[PDB]
Symmetry: D2
Subunit: 195 residues, 4 copies
């Protein structure tokens, strides 16, 4: 059934002064809405190509499904990842961060750095690799969804996520976003990934 | 489900340009595998889509492009080759002369880019309906040709020549022009113009 | 010798109301400056890797050279491509646009559309293909320089090029930029490409 | 300029796992070509850089990565194979057991991803000095392994197996473990830990 724009868990100004009201409103009401609308259109066209046996057409649609489907996935997670009252990591998550990265401080630095270094548009991720039972960090280009691991915490470093407030200074945004990291949600995602 | 098409000729009909063992393996093993895998991946993809698993549906894309591309590319390629391929129709020859100067220039230019492919892939002559022109391009791996109509393809995966030509890809790419099925290429051209 | 940030051919507010003063100032003084500074650093590291015979290291530096070197190339061209008094295409350029695209209106639409459709960060280009003696349009991802043809006119569709003024509405920017297309410069580039 | 290294063994020493014709062509023709081209491209690149032609220097990057990668990858690969490769040192075996459970799990997991390479490429076992762990990865075409130290590589370009194994890549990838030079792999491991 059809994809829909999820309501945010908070009002558009609830993350000030870390993320502005204007940024939240445009990012949700315009950017994410566009990914959803275009996603529904692409899924229709793909369902038609598959039904008709138009293999070339079905292949040709893949980048648009990845882009808009990834936009939907990534943003949906991102809204659940942000809070004014984020709390602290669960003990078990905190313990695993210490095991895999040494400390939360190291994790935040190492993820901030790779996220900061993204060339162009993309995302930084903290994820959980089920196979090897370890936390990992990665970046993704554009809206490519995080693959090979379960997403826990995402940082959108598309210039739309920060330019209106932080201008060119991407590092100020990436460092500041940790202050609104929704650790309750991130810990819930970690618990589910270990099931 | 998708099926392996029969070749329009016997496995040895392209000797001495492409060998029997190459045609047999290429068709019965390589193309077969793309077809069989295409069917498995299409099945996995339908489950993912019918269940709402967008992430898994996106994760299956590369296998669909690869095996689906494999099926598309090879199916065109077999129709592109002939023991006696004739000559290009007058309309195609005139178009080749318009857009490349001569057949010689087209062959050289398409051979050169196809030889230069880094890794596995394909060289193509195609027709851009929009700007009403012939174009040459390459594709990586089994990516299908997009943005123009395919007319003539040259498989430069190593499995396409190695048993016979060993490392000498250029010899294979220059030699395949001897068996280019110009009857088929011309028909694809005529159909691309309608 | 060392790369430097070129002075703009105009003052930071000279393209209002099509491109804001704030956008011009950040884009030149901060974004392009960063590409230049990082480019010089990367060229040094590459010259060292080559001198030492450190082939793996020289290969590893390539994405950063492409990114920052491309940033320098692309922006350098882009500033010369913009003017308040852009004039009109030379007769010969106009005649070739008509030959290859039917009309200027068609060219502007077709280039605007592909530029608008860029997934992520990138550029739209009008270029000249010397081999086939034809105008072409293309997009490039991120800062990848236009290859296979001589660049004539570039449209930066990184969100930094427009978000402060146009917000999410990229099409309004892409359509509007044609009003400040420096046709004198573009025509000069066309003449040189045909030599 | 770069040179083709001699093999540490005679062309037939890996029979029956890899044939004489494969080793000869692979070394004398494939690797030679990467070396020779590497030299040509390095020359073109130096002219571009010394003249300030940034655009042309960027345009030559893919040929440097490809031929330079080719030289890097093959040079490691020849040292990675042996008629009698021994067994992993105790320190490497313990590390393999820590990070993969057993040698069996490592072999299966690396074989599976290497077999799955779409097109040409390589499978690698490497060591991540930062997080102090073994990792497995694949690389496309001749891209060199980056972000970890290379320990053991498996060439899955078709030229590496086709003359002998034909289409049956899995057989070649499972069989190469028989000739993995664990003396060399262990030395690379010891050097990766210093
Ligand atoms: Mn976003
Ligand atoms: Mn093939
Ligand atoms: Mn820019
Ligand atoms: Mn090889």
């Amino acid at each position: 059934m059809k994809h829909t724009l999820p309501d945010l868990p908070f009002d558009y100004a609830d993350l000030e002064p870390v993320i502005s009201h204007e940024i939240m409103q445009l990012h949700h009401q315009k950017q994410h809405a566009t990914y959803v609308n275009n996603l529904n259109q692409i899924e229709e066209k793909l369902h038609e190509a598959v039904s008709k046996g138009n293999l070339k057409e079905a292949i040709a649609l893949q980048p648009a499904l990845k882009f808009n489907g990834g936009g939907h996935i990534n943003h949906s997670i991102f809204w659940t990842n942000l809070a004014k009252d984020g709390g602290e990591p669960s003990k078990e998550l905190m313990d695993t961060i210490k095991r895999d990265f040494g400390s939360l401080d190291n994790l935040q630095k190492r993820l901030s750095d790779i996220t900061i270094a993204v060339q162009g548009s993309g995302w930084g991720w903290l994820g959980y690799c089920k196979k090897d039972k370890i936390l990992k960090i990665a970046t993704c280009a554009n809206q490519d969804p995080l693959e090979g691991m379960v997403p826990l915490f995402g940082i959108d470093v598309w210039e739309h996520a920060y330019y209106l407030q932080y201008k060119n200074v991407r590092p100020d945004y990436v460092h500041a976003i940790w202050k609104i990291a929704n650790w309750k949600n991130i810990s819930e995602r970690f618990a589910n990934a270990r099931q």
